[PDB]
Amino acid sequence: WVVAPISVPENGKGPFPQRLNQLKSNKDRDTKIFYSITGPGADSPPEGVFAVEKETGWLLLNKPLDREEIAKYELFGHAVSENGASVEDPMNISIIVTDQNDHKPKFTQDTFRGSVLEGVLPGTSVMQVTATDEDDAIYTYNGVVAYSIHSQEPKDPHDLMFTIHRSTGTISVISSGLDREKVPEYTLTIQATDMDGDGSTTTAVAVVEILD
Ligand SMILES: Cc1[nH]c2ccc(Cl)cc2c1CCN
Ligand SMILES: [Ca+2]
Ligand SMILES: [Ca+2]
Ligand SMILES: [Ca+2]
Ligand SMILES: [Ca+2]
């Protein structure tokens, strides 16, 4: 028989065991048929994730999936007559694990550093920060990053002298007045928010050094 690939959102919560699909042998007219399942997730590590009911053929999921651990399973179903003979061809069972937004973006570094000549103009780029989200960024924004500036210290000649590009993470100088003799170094706190700014948010540091 044939089962069409099955899409299960990770991190579900049943109730378990959850019935995913029912395997059927045509030959249950000449005998009772005993069903069984084999493959990664069933009888090899990680064992017990999937299972099939001996008599009914109901395909079972026994625990929530974690797409970030195993995104896809390829199981194999088998029909055995009561007298012990295999009655069908081994049927492939495809399980695809679909993403929920269960990861917080992380900066590639705890502290990014960069320099600029005291005299550069507003609009000048200093550095490019990056954050990585293990969630899916293809069909959803669960792993898309929005960048923000958390805070600026110190605040002379005033606050918010830097902006960050929302998608690229490029930090730029937006105001005049830089001066090494007055403030050699600015310590920015940077933020990264998945769902393109709507979800979880993590922080890092950006140290901008002012070059005489
Ligand atoms: C590839 C794919 N296709 C989907 C179709 C529907 C839903 Cl809700 C989610 C998905 C995903 C995310 C898996 N990374
Ligand atoms: Ca997960
Ligand atoms: Ca995420
Ligand atoms: Ca996820
Ligand atoms: Ca929110």
**Spatial strand order in the sheet of 146-153:** 111-117, 201-211, 185-193, 146-153
For ligand 1, whether the C-beta of 88 sits within 6 Å is: no
Distance from residue 73's CA to the centre of ligand 4 (Å): 17
Closest CA to 37 of 97, 87, 83, 80: 80
- Ligand 1: which residue has its CA nearest to atom 7? 98
Residue 136 Cα: closest atom of ligand 1: 14
Resolution of the model in angstroms: 2.3
136, 64, 21, 71: CA torsion to nearest 10: 30
| Cβ(61)–Cβ(50) below 8 Å | yes
CA distance 137 to 133: 8
Distance from residue 198's CA to the centre of ligand 5 (Å): 5
Question: Six-digit token pair at 203?
Answer: 């922080």
Query: For the chain, what's the residue count?
Result: 212
- Ligand 1: which residue has its CA nearest to atom 3? 98
For ligand 1, whether the C-beta of 139 sits within 6 Å is: yes
Amino acid residing at 151 = S
Question: Six-digit token pair at 47?
Answer: 């064992």
- Strands 6-9 and 91-98, sheet pairing: parallel
For ligand 1, whether the C-beta of 135 sits within 6 Å is: no
| Cα Rg of the chain (Å, integer) | 28
Residues ≥6 apart with Cβ < 8 Å to 174? 122, 123, 160, 161, 162, 163
How was this one solved?
A: X-ray
Distance from residue 181's CA to the centre of ligand 1 (Å): 54
> Running DSSP on this structure, what letter comes out for residue 14?
-
- Strands 111-117 and 146-153, sheet pairing: unpaired
Buried b (16+ CB within 10 A) or exposed e, 41-70: bbeeeeeebbbbeeeebbbbbeeebebbee
CA distance 166 to 189: 15
- Ligand 1: which residue has its CA nearest to atom 2? 98
